[PDB]
From Swiss-Prot, chain A:
Biotechnology remark: Co-administration of salinamide and rifampicin or salinamide and myxopyronin suppresses the emergence of resistance to both antibiotics.
Protein's name in the database: DNA-directed RNA polymerase subunit beta
Species this protein is from: Escherichia coli (strain K12)
Domain of life: Bacteria
Family recorded in the similarity comment: Belongs to the RNA polymerase beta chain family.
Known function: DNA-dependent RNA polymerase (RNAP) catalyzes the transcription of DNA into RNA using the four ribonucleoside triphosphates as substrates.
Processing after translation: Acetylated on several lysine residues in the presence of glucose.
Taxonomic placement: Bacteria, Pseudomonadati, Pseudomonadota, Gammaproteobacteria, Enterobacterales
Subunit structure: The RNAP catalytic core consists of 2 alpha, 1 beta, 1 beta' and 1 omega subunit. When a sigma factor is associated with the core the holoenzyme is formed, which can initiate transcription. The rRNA transcription and antitermination complex (rrnTAC) consists of RNAP, NusA, NusB, NusE (rpsJ), NusG, SubB, ribosomal protein S4, DNA and precursor rRNA; S4 is more flexible than other subunits. In pull-down experiments interacts with CedA. (Microbial infection) Interacts (via flap domain) with Escherichia phage lambda antitermination protein Q; this interaction renders bacterial RNAP resistant to transcription pausing and allows it to read through termination signals.
Swiss-Prot record, chain B:
Function of the protein: DNA-dependent RNA polymerase (RNAP) catalyzes the transcription of DNA into RNA using the four ribonucleoside triphosphates as substrates. This subunit plays an important role in subunit assembly since its dimerization is the first step in the sequential assembly of subunits to form the holoenzyme. Part of the processive rRNA transcription and antitermination complex (rrnTAC). The complex forms an RNA-chaperone ring around the RNA exit tunnel of RNAP. It supports rapid transcription and antitermination of rRNA operons, cotranscriptional rRNA folding, and annealing of distal rRNA regions to allow correct ribosome biogenesis.
SUPFAM superfamilies xrefs: C-terminal domain of RNA polymerase alpha subunit, Insert subdomain of RNA polymerase alpha subunit, RBP11-like subunits of RNA polymerase
NCBIfam families named in the record: PRK05182.1-2, PRK05182.2-5, rpoA
Region: Alpha C-terminal domain (alpha-CTD), residue numbers: 223-298
N6-acetyllysine, modified sites: 271-272
Chemical reaction(s) catalysed: RNA(n) + a ribonucleoside 5'-triphosphate = RNA(n+1) + diphosphate
Descriptive protein name: DNA-directed RNA polymerase subunit alpha
Gene (UniProt): rpoA
Organism: Escherichia coli (strain K12)
Amino acid sequence: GVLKIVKVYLAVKRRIQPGDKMAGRHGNKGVISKINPIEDMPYDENGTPV
Amino acid sequence: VTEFLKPRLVDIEQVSSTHAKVTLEPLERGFGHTLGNALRRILLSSMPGCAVTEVEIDGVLHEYSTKEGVQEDILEILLNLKGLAVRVQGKDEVILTLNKSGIGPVTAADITHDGDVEIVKPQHVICHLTDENASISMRIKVQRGRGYVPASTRIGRLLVDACYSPVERIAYNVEAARVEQRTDLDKLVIEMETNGTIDPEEAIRRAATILAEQLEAFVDPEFDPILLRPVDDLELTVRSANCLKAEAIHYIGDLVQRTEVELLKTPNLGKKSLTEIKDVLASRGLSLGMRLENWPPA
Amino acid sequence: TEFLKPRLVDIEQVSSTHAKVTLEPLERGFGHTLGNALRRILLSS
Amino acid sequence: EIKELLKLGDLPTSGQIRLYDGRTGEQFERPVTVGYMYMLKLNHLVDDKM
């Protein structure tokens, strides 16, 4: 019954955003709740933000 | 009533080509952290810099492609292009051409020398041509802007995440300033680690300019819409559209006002074209010689 | 090559000597920047 | 041994460092541990679920 089949492969790049889930190897897991600009981030004396 | 002691850029210690130590002299206490934070906040996000926004590589269509004769895939190449540090004279968009044939790394130094364009790090690797019959020819678009503007912030071309800000890292120290007079003065030492697009002093005067400008005081339907659509929305033949535009007919409202007589009297329009135009107009409930009486309002 | 500067103002007089002025549409991060600069000037200068 | 590496690292031995609040510039009132952690982005993404 099938005349023709078309498959379309679409590629998408996903950037980390609020609601995505991150975790470490020790069982510490959590969802991203806030993305705050670099200047608001806690930083070391030499200026490196975390 | 003791008027405040104001700062002025006093020293510049270029630890390197992209790392400096600016010092503002004689600042009243507590102002160290105040200006330190205001400035650190402007510098880390409000600085203007050039960044690659689009790239046109020959033979490549989608960024997912991989190239015959190139070590890294197109994605890696665009990711390399993100790190292209360019300082442009006085423009908000410049096209760089990169032609390279041979074996070995294709660095930013291989980019065609433009008079305006300054390439901060010529040894910056963009590619790696594997075989000696391999070659790349690409057009890198560099634009001026602010902050981090991703490619997702939207033709056989590709888009690259724009990192406009010239500054990577900022640090500051408050340190007591000298001079036996008054004694209770400090000096703000701003340690900068930029990408080499911007000079220390102008970065400071621009952060200060943005700050000061933020502080600028504190004070206290009828008619058919289709008529304002461009003629291109009618989807005429290229020729007809070009002829109409050549007659200063850029919108549907302009077209529906003209009559057959007037249109045929134009140098470039014949019976075929007029027939086509009447057909496309009739297909949308429109015609020639339409009165809209009031062309236009505001 | 600009920035969003001064737009729409509001004043909430909690009392005869207590008010709440609001400067609207300042680019993200400018809230704490102006907030701390001003808080520092007001609390000492 | 980790303390030793931290020494070549130049320390603090505890692994805590003075950290500045990016909003204020004032230091956080106590020393805070900061280190490189290895973190993974899990297959659960808001894009899929919402």
